[PDB]
Amino acid sequence: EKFLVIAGMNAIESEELLLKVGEEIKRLSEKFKEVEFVFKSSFDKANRSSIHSFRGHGLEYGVKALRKVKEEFGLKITTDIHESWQAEPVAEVADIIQIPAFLCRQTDLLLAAAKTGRAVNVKKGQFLAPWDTKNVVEKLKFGGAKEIYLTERGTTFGYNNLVVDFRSLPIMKQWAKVIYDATHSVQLPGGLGDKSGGMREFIFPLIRAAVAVGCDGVFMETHPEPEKALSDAPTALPLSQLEGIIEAILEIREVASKYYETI
Amino acid sequence: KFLVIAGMNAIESEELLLKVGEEIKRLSEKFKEVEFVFKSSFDKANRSSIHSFRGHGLEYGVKALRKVKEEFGLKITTDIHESWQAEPVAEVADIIQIPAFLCRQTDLLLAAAKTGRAVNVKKGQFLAPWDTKNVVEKLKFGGAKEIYLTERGTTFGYNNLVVDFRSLPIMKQWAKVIYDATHSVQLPGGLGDKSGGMREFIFPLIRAAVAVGCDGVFMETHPEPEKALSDAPTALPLSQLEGIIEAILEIREVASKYYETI
Amino acid sequence: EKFLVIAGMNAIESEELLLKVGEEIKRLSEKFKEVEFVFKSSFDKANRSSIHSFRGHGLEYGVKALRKVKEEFGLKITTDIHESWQAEPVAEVADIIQIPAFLCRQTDLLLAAAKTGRAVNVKKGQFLAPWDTKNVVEKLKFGGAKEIYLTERGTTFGYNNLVVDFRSLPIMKQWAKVIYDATHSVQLPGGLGDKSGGMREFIFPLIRAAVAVGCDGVFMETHPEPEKALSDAPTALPLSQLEGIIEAILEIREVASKYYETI
Amino acid sequence: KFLVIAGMNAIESEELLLKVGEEIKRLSEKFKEVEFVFKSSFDKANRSSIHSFRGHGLEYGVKALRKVKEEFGLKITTDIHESWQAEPVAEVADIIQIPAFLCRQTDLLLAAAKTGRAVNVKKGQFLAPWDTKNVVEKLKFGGAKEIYLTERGTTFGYNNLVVDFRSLPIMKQWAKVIYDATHSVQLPGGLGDKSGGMREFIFPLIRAAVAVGCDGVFMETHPEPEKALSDAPTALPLSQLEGIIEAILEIREVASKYYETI
Numbered sequence A, C: 001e002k003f004l005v006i007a008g009m010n011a012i013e014s015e016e017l018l019l020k021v022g023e024e025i026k027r028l029s030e031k032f033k034e035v036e037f038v039f040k041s042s043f044d045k046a047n048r049s050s051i052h053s054f055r056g057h058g059l060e061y062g063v064k065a066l067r068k069v070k071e072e073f074g075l076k077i078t079t080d081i082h083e084s085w086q087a088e089p090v091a092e093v094a095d096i097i098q099i100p101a102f103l104c105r106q107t108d109l110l111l112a113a114a115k116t117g118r119a120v121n122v123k124k125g126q127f128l129a130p131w132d133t134k135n136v137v138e139k140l141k142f143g144g145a146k147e148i149y150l151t152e153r154g155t156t157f158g159y160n161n162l163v164v165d166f167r168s169l170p171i172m173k174q175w176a177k178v179i180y181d182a183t184h185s186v187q188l189p190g191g192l193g194d195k196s197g198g199m200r201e202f203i204f205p206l207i208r209a210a211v212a213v214g215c216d217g218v219f220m221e222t223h224p225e226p227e228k229a230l231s232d233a234p235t236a237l238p239l240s241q242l243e244g245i246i247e248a249i250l251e252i253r254e255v256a257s258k259y260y261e262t263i
Numbered sequence B, D: 001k002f003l004v005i006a007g008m009n010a011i012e013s014e015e016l017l018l019k020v021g022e023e024i025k026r027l028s029e030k031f032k033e034v035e036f037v038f039k040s041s042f043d044k045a046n047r048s049s050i051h052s053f054r055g056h057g058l059e060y061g062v063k064a065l066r067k068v069k070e071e072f073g074l075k076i077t078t079d080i081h082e083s084w085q086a087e088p089v090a091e092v093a094d095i096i097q098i099p100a101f102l103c104r105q106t107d108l109l110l111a112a113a114k115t116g117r118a119v120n121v122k123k124g125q126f127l128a129p130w131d132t133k134n135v136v137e138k139l140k141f142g143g144a145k146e147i148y149l150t151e152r153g154t155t156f157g158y159n160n161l162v163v164d165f166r167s168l169p170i171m172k173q174w175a176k177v178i179y180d181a182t183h184s185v186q187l188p189g190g191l192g193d194k195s196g197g198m199r200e201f202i203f204p205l206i207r208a209a210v211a212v213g214c215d216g217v218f219m220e221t222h223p224e225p226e227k228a229l230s231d232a233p234t235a236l237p238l239s240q241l242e243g244i245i246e247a248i249l250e251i252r253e254v255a256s257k258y259y260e261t262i
């Protein structure tokens, strides 16, 4: 099946920066034709640790910025919602509606996304066991979702740290397509006090493990200059490095794929 | 004075809420040394299964809570799940409760703060004790004056929660601390389509909470927990509430002498 | 039943310092007559993180130092063993033989302690679940142990951190007397790089929880001047504070005891 | 070259050890690109239950290992539990293995180092990746020259282990890293009187190990795991060893291009 690569910018800092990333993703989509690319960005960071951190420029502005990316580059779009009412307006531009990790248990948010007819991708809560995502998928199907994804983004391991339990990939594959969030799986929640920390040095190694184990796609956040990111500065991947990473995981996927177990 | 938040997990019917409110009222008259606050949810917006009990809606719930408040003169507290619910709930709730999974949703916290009511935030199972300082700051920013932080367990491996009592002293630095004796022993998604829990540890850990030092306790009860529509494994039998309260007041009286300063 | 208070110095730095602590413990035993005191110290720290850290002055010297404490103060003695052969020589002076946390699963070490006829106290490994200590007690009984204790000293919670799951007290009480190690439960394993860290500020609060929940005794490490300790410097309790802590837990134990659940 | 440590958890009989050694020898002849080391324990000194299988003693075990080495010319590795065992074991073992629970026992490490043999330390389930730097230093101090650090899971809640693959890159800074594909999926004391495990995850995680980058893999096998006297839930069927080895060599070949420098 066609490997999915969700990539973009964690937050919509400016429509201009968004298009810069979109142009690169567009270029990569032309090269890696065997990959289905979906552009990602959030119109709002509704769960920053601090009240003083960047959130965004509003749903209206965000949707406008995303629609511009879809129109100018012909790229599929994905963004996350935080409250039920946002599902309808977002569904107009988003091909895949993302459900934040902390909200993976909020029945109404899930139902609101499902009735739009759009694909739904749920970030697995850091408090959730792999086998407990089965009920998450059941809620979505109940609400009309036909295309469902579950994203592995790490699990609470002690304080301010996350661990990736790769056993979750084959477990979750039993009821939905699985995506590996290579970015947030290495973040250190609240690690920097008023902001979360992260270890970029482990992004690549862990993504290699992800494709070796076997998944249906990867999620990666990028930025032209991570150091200047308004969110995920510690984990944003330099845009120039995206191509090399994708090539690498496609190669590892190919050689490992014959050994992928059948569910 | 010491705060005791009690009631039942969900509003299964105003008839049941009234039965429980009656007992809480009685206890309230028996323990003048305690400030009781009646709690119940008008909606279980985060059940594991789509087929589990959620409630009768916001309308029915707010009405039931009003009845409890008018029929027993008891303060009220209930949780909200989306920003728009803060205003209508504030009309009856003396304390707006923020769910654990939602402790980081800025707009929810701000909506609660804006109502002018007191706010009690359940500490996320994914949150470190010191990470609550920022939660408090958001509320102060939103104009909140009476802020509570509730300890309800931390993720410990899968389908299990552990109570790290070092959190009480730590959180007390920036807010009043409440100990949720009910959910701290629950086993997240333990029964598959529902969460589990071990009631035998409720009392022991509640004693630890007051020995350590907290500003209040949170307890969910039910006439017949066997028939509870939520928190069935952890709901405390109504008849046992009095004994436990008297117990923690006695322990608190002796232990309070050693509570470290802020 | 008579509450047990195991106290002393983590390591036998010098026979002189040992006697200084013993004198204070002796004084407290005279005051708190309802408490059974047992003097503790290790003739060897066989598991320091670094090869450069203090270990001790040998089994021979240690036993001699301990025997001096027992003779001069008439105090019961307890010390830990690391290899099977040490059980015999140690049993000559130790009333209770302690089994290190990392070694709680070493069958031979446990058996060696049990056949001496002495009481045995096993520190619950940081990797052990409360209910898995049942097999630990079974091994000891099999080996002849008639007086067995299980000590709660924290559980691995993420890296370099330990959490105390007080549910372990009533669970473990089902098969053995339970002791709460107020000292090591707040240590940060490997926290200081070549040495473990710790948070002394939580020692008192956690010990209060221990007696409120209900245990059969407490274990506390002390030192005239913690800052100068050769081991457990971050968690050693000032000797002058020992009396106040004991008085406090006896008071909390009394008021809470009527509520202790029956196993 | 790539290291593959294989054999069976316990020496149930030299007859069985020889059957397994034969297969390992065959594979050794098939994969010249790999260095095979035969492993087996002469004693399970840490079983959960007093009634579980330990072995036939140090004497019987060392003799059985000698037979394997002489009859197949395969290098040997076995674990020690007390300091006195290092010398007699060193006579046959090319690599002395240090158990996970004992990774902090200074005298055990020193005794192993003193024999002059290579030493492989199982990373304690209670140890942080960076905490192994000190383990290595003790061995260097004791004169150890060939030092290995093995990843075998970390405590994650109760009766469960999680493999944090960030440990491979971290540990590689101070030693060669081996991935124990067998015990990393075991469930400590999961069956009550015995430990559990999930064999379905052995292969998937072994693939992750080589995709990330390690100097070797550790695998326990058994003709009929159903009849194994230890590691029954995790022992890999002997017939499946070849397929998995070929698989990790292929993945390693492609992935090695991206292994970060030390």
Ligand SMILES: O=P(O)(O)OC[C@@H](O)[C@@H](O)[C@H](O)CO
Pocket (backbone or CB within 6 Å): A010, A045, A047, A048, A049, A050, A053, A184, A187, A189, A190, A194, A195, A196, A231, A232
């Ligand atoms: O406010 P901080 O803690 O930096 O949070 C960063 C997060 O918002 C980021 O990891 C992500 O968008 C999570 O929700």
Ligand SMILES: O=P(O)(O)OC[C@@H](O)[C@@H](O)[C@H](O)CO
Pocket (backbone or CB within 6 Å): B009, B044, B046, B047, B048, B049, B052, B099, B100, B183, B186, B188, B189, B193, B194, B195, B196, B230, B231
């Ligand atoms: O997993 P289930 O059983 O649906 O449980 C959800 C409950 O524990 C819920 O009431 C709890 O208060 C969640 O916040």
Ligand SMILES: O=P(O)(O)OC[C@@H](O)[C@@H](O)[C@H](O)CO
Pocket (backbone or CB within 6 Å): C010, C045, C047, C048, C049, C050, C053, C184, C187, C189, C190, C194, C195, C196, C231, C232
């Ligand atoms: O070498 P470090 O890591 O400081 O170890 C201190 C320990 O020996 C101490 O916590 C205790 O004696 C544990 O075994």
Ligand SMILES: O=P(O)(O)OC[C@@H](O)[C@@H](O)[C@H](O)CO
Pocket (backbone or CB within 6 Å): D009, D044, D046, D047, D048, D049, D052, D099, D100, D183, D186, D188, D189, D193, D194, D195, D196, D230, D231
């Ligand atoms: O808990 P039980 O089943 O006795 O298991 C012990 C085994 O897993 C043992 O062989 C393992 O290698 C311990 O180190």
